[PDB]
Amino acid sequence: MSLEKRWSLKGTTALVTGGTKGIGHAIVEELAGFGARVYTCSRNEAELTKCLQEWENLNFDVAGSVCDIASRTEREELMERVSSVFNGNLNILINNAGGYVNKPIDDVTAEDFSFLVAVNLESAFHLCQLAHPMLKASGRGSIVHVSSCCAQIALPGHSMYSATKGAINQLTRNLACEWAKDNIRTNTVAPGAIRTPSSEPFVNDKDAVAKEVARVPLGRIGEPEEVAAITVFLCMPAASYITGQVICVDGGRTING
Amino acid sequence: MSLEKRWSLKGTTALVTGGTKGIGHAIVEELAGFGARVYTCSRNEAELTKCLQEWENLNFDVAGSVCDIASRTEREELMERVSSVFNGNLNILINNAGGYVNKPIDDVTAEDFSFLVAVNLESAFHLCQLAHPMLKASGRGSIVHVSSCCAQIALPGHSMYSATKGAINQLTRNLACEWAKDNIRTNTVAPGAIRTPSSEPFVNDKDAVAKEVARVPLGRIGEPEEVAAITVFLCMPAASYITGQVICVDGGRTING
Amino acid sequence: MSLEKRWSLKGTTALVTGGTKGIGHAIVEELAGFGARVYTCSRNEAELTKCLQEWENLNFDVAGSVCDIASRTEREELMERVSSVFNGNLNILINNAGGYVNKPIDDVTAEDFSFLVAVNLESAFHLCQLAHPMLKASGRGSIVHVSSCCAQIALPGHSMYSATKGAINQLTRNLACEWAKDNIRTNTVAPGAIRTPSSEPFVNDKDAVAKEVARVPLGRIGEPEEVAAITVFLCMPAASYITGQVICVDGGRTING
Amino acid sequence: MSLEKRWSLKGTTALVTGGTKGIGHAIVEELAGFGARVYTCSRNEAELTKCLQEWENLNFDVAGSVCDIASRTEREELMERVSSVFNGNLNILINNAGGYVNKPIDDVTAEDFSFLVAVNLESAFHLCQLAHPMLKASGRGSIVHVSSCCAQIALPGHSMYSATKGAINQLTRNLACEWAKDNIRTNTVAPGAIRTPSSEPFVNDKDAVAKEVARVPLGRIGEPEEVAAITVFLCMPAASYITGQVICVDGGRTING
């Protein structure tokens, strides 16, 4: 296969959960920029409609609908709309939307626990199950979860958040092996500190980011499109021999002494 | 500190969940053999009473009560009995009891998901929270989760089971870092195929174990006391500089090509 | 930067060691396909000349000279020619050329040891040293080592080969952290079994292929351009936040139980 | 086997390279404390003689001879003496003695490279080869390398040192798999900062200590016997199912964000 084909996504369809802000927003534009048809979602109808209007002016083909992926019913309705819009053919699934709690281990409540598990673990797992017939039908499927580099080290207050992301890391390996017979590859991008609306409060704390950036060899927090780039590459045919891998996008955070 | 003291557990107290069968049963006898006072539990009153009667004849000091660690209420009652029996001083917590489901990813039900998470992840997490005041009060605390070597590789049908065990692996690192100030170390033993009542059906399938043992460099399945030995060592003062680690007890399974 | 600029190597200069066959040949053509001026080498003058002739006819700007990277003097002369050709401005360094010995541990000779160390480890380390001033001068530097997925698992007869590759994996982390101040990133691509002239004896052993393929979830040996694609991506500005990582390109080999 | 027999080295024979100071000295006394007949070595005749005199007075059966493990001829003469002393029956091989250089990557000289490779990598590999017939003859063999926790992260000035130790980590996996048929297990203990005569310049730099201690969850540098304890455990029959593992002994250093 030629270079132009191997580095292209024209004629592919993709689903990105939580694509109205930050990393997921960058992933949607990065996928559409390489010729993919993108479907996304969020919980805010006004914000989602503004983004769909913005992407239309950029000549992108992006559809979407309101969906809280922490609800089993709404995950099923979402995959039913995706299956009808894309005619049951889905090439790409990006499990981007997540949830975050920053509390010491003693302070994690029962509701904190179930919230993180529902949005970070059960949602991705169920969406993979629902996507399986469509990924197999497309002929070339690519699942990319976005996890966190703190699923390999210990950060203060990240216990249950990092634990759910660690489960996602292992789920990557099971999916890659079980669904290899369906020509479906599964990988994970694990970001470090990235400038998103969710990381804004931490970013506006001068003393907090100074502690963080000092641990980063590249000496800065990452940008959303620095995560979206590798995410998109893993979905290209050029990555046809890469499956089951956890790629850290952290500027060297986790490997730094 | 002398060699005899560093390799001893005399004068310590321990809690082992699910200590009536298999690995947990071996852990209880291994802890008691080194002079520890052991508290354990299971869901079967008759079987638990027989084990407590057996350990009494072996001159062990083992107490216990019926408890389903998948229930939040029963976990709280258990830690209240442990706190009264041990006078609020607990040195060792062994999160041994677990749950297992063997199904392809497509077949994992919503009830399969919540069952595995409750017994493998939430129970261990909550029991650590409840044990924290007593571990800090003892002056030298040791938490050991028992996970699985399949939280680092992909085995058929192990998806959600391995995913919960992967979360346990990351939780080890958070606990070791957050509670280091309380002189509490946290580690994890990750067993391979071990001869227990739970692994019996797989063990009695000649073709299935032949596939498994062929992947094991040592050419056999492990015994329960091969897991209990390292578990006990991690609780001794000799392991005083080992914390946050995931030790695989698999006969070389996961590192074998 | 825009999408077009982030996914481009236009205006860059690169060095690939061993680009006349196999993976290195795929990397050269992949780099030039994205607009990079390439310099390559090998030990065979006639073969390198034919490659340079072929690449010029494909309108690539690729230069080359004969060099045995296992020779310190020839590594210095190589980096001297690269400096004059590119005017002391080098963006990319790909350490591809290596050596291989398949013998049990009892059979590895002292000459086998020193050969594997010289070609797989010392060459890459020294070339990084000699390239450091030029990479810093470019303003945007990217080092990529080609290691092996068997640096994480044990394959029969791979002991010393995998040991040197394991040393490469660690060197990646040191290079990423020490030279991040110079705007240089360092990563590593660790391939599985790839169809190259070196692997030809392994590929023509139908029994040995079937044994290896059975352990690969994707059910096949990789192709050279499947390694070259991710190699080139790690050199693009799109990978600006990825450093110190070892990316296994093996079709799921190392994570398949 | 019973508890007493599984946690015993009575009747065993061991070899520790570099047992006159620091970690190796702790390993010798720890092995003999459990009943093992030990053989050790160093490059200083007077110091080794005093150690042998001290160990005899403590009623240990420890023998020794002068040997520079960086010399192939002296490694062969060493293993020749070990064979006659133990009558060709060797249970345990501890590769403790090593070398260290702290320089930035730009400053590592060709002599620094070859020195680190010879003492940290080639010595251990060759000694394993020479010990293989004796370990197989013992009927129960155990190899333990002493690597470093910095073979998983990047510390300033550790590049080549950590690279050789990273090679040791991989060699552990090959040795465990190739020699499992001979009833030989191979594992690795990877220490953090330990109070040894070698680390004395680092320990007497109050600024350098505080910088390192701040990254250690346990908030202190380790002690030699904290490394020796787990080293001895991996040689006991109790560890019969543990092989091919790298156990970090660093107080949580490598997993602390």
Ligand SMILES: NC(=O)c1ccc[n+]([C@@H]2O[C@H](COP(=O)([O-])OP(=O)(O)OC[C@H]3O[C@@H](n4cnc5c(N)ncnc54)[C@H](OP(=O)(O)O)[C@@H]3O)[C@@H](O)[C@H]2O)c1
């Ligand atoms: N520093 C970092 O940013 C960082 C570091 C490590 C890992 N990560 C991971 O990277 C991923 C991206 O995170 P982010 O930083 O972009 O912030 P985020 O809050 O995880 O992403 C927010 C986007 O997802 C949507 N969303 C949130 N919860 C949702 C739900 N339950 N159902 C449907 N949509 C939902 C949001 O829209 P609405 O709020 O309107 O629903 C918004 O469009 C996350 O999974 C996170 O765990 C981020």
Ligand SMILES: NC(=O)c1ccc[n+]([C@@H]2O[C@H](COP(=O)([O-])OP(=O)(O)OC[C@H]3O[C@@H](n4cnc5c(N)ncnc54)[C@H](OP(=O)(O)O)[C@@H]3O)[C@@H](O)[C@H]2O)c1
């Ligand atoms: N091959 C293997 O055996 C293997 C491999 C990898 C990992 N592991 C892990 O090693 C650990 C030990 O497992 P195992 O093989 O000994 O079998 P297991 O079924 O996990 O352990 C059973 C013991 O725990 C008790 N138990 C089970 N569920 C419980 C609950 N909800 N509440 C309280 N007690 C409970 C059982 O008593 P009752 O049933 O009477 O309650 C029994 O005493 C598990 O966590 C498992 O995940 C085992």
Ligand SMILES: NC(=O)c1ccc[n+]([C@@H]2O[C@H](COP(=O)([O-])OP(=O)(O)OC[C@H]3O[C@@H](n4cnc5c(N)ncnc54)[C@H](OP(=O)(O)O)[C@@H]3O)[C@@H](O)[C@H]2O)c1
């Ligand atoms: N299955 C696989 O192919 C596989 C698997 C894992 C890792 N790898 C790694 O991936 C890399 C690519 O290997 P490959 O299979 O492409 O090898 P290959 O097909 O034999 O290619 C070797 C290339 O490097 C050149 N070369 C070899 N030794 C050299 C030296 N001392 N100095 C200068 N040039 C030299 C060769 O040219 P001359 O021979 O004319 O000098 C040739 O152009 C290697 O580092 C290998 O260790 C490969």
Ligand SMILES: NC(=O)c1ccc[n+]([C@@H]2O[C@H](COP(=O)([O-])OP(=O)(O)OC[C@H]3O[C@@H](n4cnc5c(N)ncnc54)[C@H](OP(=O)(O)O)[C@@H]3O)[C@@H](O)[C@H]2O)c1
């Ligand atoms: N902070 C740490 O201490 C630390 C951290 C990470 C890893 N490590 C590793 O742990 C191991 C223990 O190091 P250590 O700190 O105990 O070193 P040390 O205190 O300097 O002990 C060195 C011992 O080995 C002997 N020795 C050194 N070079 C030798 C050679 N070429 N041939 C024969 N014997 C030799 C020495 O005796 P002579 O000098 O009289 O020959 C001495 O008995 C080393 O492999 C080291 O790389 C240590």
